[PDB]
Design a protein around this ligand. Structure first.
Ligand code: HEC
Length: 107
């Protein structure tokens, strides 16, 4: 869907997460090159066991179920965030995050 719209959705994430060039870890891990990556593997971040040992691989499908209700998909996770319930927002959110390569550069 719409990346430009996803950027506005991402603003709730921006508080804890960084994306794009020069992104660094904050309260949450950097989200550059998220899709396809295994959960709990961004270097330098202190993940909870819940996240680190979950065995999840981030695909669009799994990401959509997770962002809807984080604590439901990863009980005990440190990401105390309510989640994004809107079907359209999630699709735009995905479109926005997918533009980035692991190094922050735009595809
Ligand atoms: C701080 C109050 C956060 C907000 C708002 C959002 N996220 Fe977050 N996220 C945060 C933490 C502390 C962590 C680590 C959790 C843990 O248990 O260690 C995370 C993690 C994620 C992950 C998994 C990352 C990975 O496995 O490498 C994802 C995919 C993620 N968060 C995405 C995300 C999005 C898209 C958000 C806005 C809708 C969002 N988070 C908000 C902290 C915070």
């Amino acid at each position: 869907q719409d990346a430009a719209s996803g950027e506005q959705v991402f603003k709730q994430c921006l508080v804890c997460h960084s994306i794009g060039p020069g992104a660094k870890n904050k309260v949450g891990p950097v989200l550059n090159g998220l899709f396809g990556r295994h959960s709990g593997t961004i270097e330098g971040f202190a993940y909870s066991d819940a996240n680190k040992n979950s065995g999840i691989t981030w695909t669009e499908e799994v990401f959509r179920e997770y962002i809807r209700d984080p604590k439901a998909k990863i009980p005990g996770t440190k990401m105390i965030f309510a989640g994004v319930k809107d079907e359209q927002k999630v699709s735009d959110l995905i479109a926005y995050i997918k533009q980035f390569n692991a190094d922050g550069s735009k595809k």
